[PDB]
């Protein structure tokens, strides 16, 4: 399996970016496998 990389752009902030998405506050746990899960 040939895994390879290709450049896609500069890392820059863009003034005219679309804005979307909410800002939830979540209780989570992170296990040994790197998996986040919700906690109550």
């Amino acid at each position: 399996v040939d895994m390879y990389i290709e450049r896609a752009g500069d890392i820059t902030w863009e003034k005219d970016a679309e804005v979307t998405g909410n800002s939830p506050r979540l209780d989570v746990a992170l296990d040994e496998s790197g998996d986040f899960s919700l906690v109550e």
């Binding site: 399996v1 040939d2 895994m3 390879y4 990389i5 290709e6 450049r7 896609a8 752009g9 500069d10 890392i11 820059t12 902030w13 863009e14 970016a17 679309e18 804005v19 979307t20 998405g21 909410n22 800002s23 939830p24 506050r25 979540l26 209780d27 989570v28 746990a29 992170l30 040994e32 496998s33 790197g34 986040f36 899960s37 919700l38």
Partner: protein, 147 residues
């Protein structure tokens, strides 16, 4: 070797993720490459540091990205979706509250091949990578390593 954001591809070709070149080091999420060597043109990039729990891996040298979300300001996901030009999506992060402290999180749901896309603060610094999270709709941690 140029600084920037890169697609991670596999062979027809498929985009499996994204990563960040900075200071001669390539940064992506462990689950994107599982630590496999990467080709870059005629060159080869070998893994240097990786951690499954953080879900991060660096190639050619140690992890270089160290900026962190300030907890108040909007950020930008520099999403590089499969088949699409790199694009900036601005958002106010929420928070993952954990027993070991709080982590910024973005409630943005892009194709899986976008995993590894950088999240940026207002100065253009990479504050973490997109693509390890939970479902409530998907919410990604802002995953940052240690320099």
């Amino acid at each position: 070797t140029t600084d920037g954001v890169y697609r991670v591809m596999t062979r027809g070709s498929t985009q499996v993720g994204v990563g960040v070149m900075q200071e001669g080091v390539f940064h992506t999420m462990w689950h994107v490459t599982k630590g496999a060597a990467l080709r870059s043109g005629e060159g080869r990039l070998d893994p240097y540091w990786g951690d499954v729990k953080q879900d991060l891996v660096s190639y050619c040298g140690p992890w270089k990205l160290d900026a962190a979300w300030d907890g108040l300001s909007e950020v930008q996901l520099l999403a590089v979706p499969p088949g699409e030009r790199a694009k900036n999506i601005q958002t106010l992060p929420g928070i993952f509250k954990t027993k070991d402290g709080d982590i910024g999180a973005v409630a943005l749901d892009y194709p899986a091949g976008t995993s590894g896309s950088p999240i940026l603060d207002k100065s253009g610094r990479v504050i973490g990578l997109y693509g390890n999270g939970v479902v409530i709709s998907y919410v990604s941690a802002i995953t940052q390593g240690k320099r």
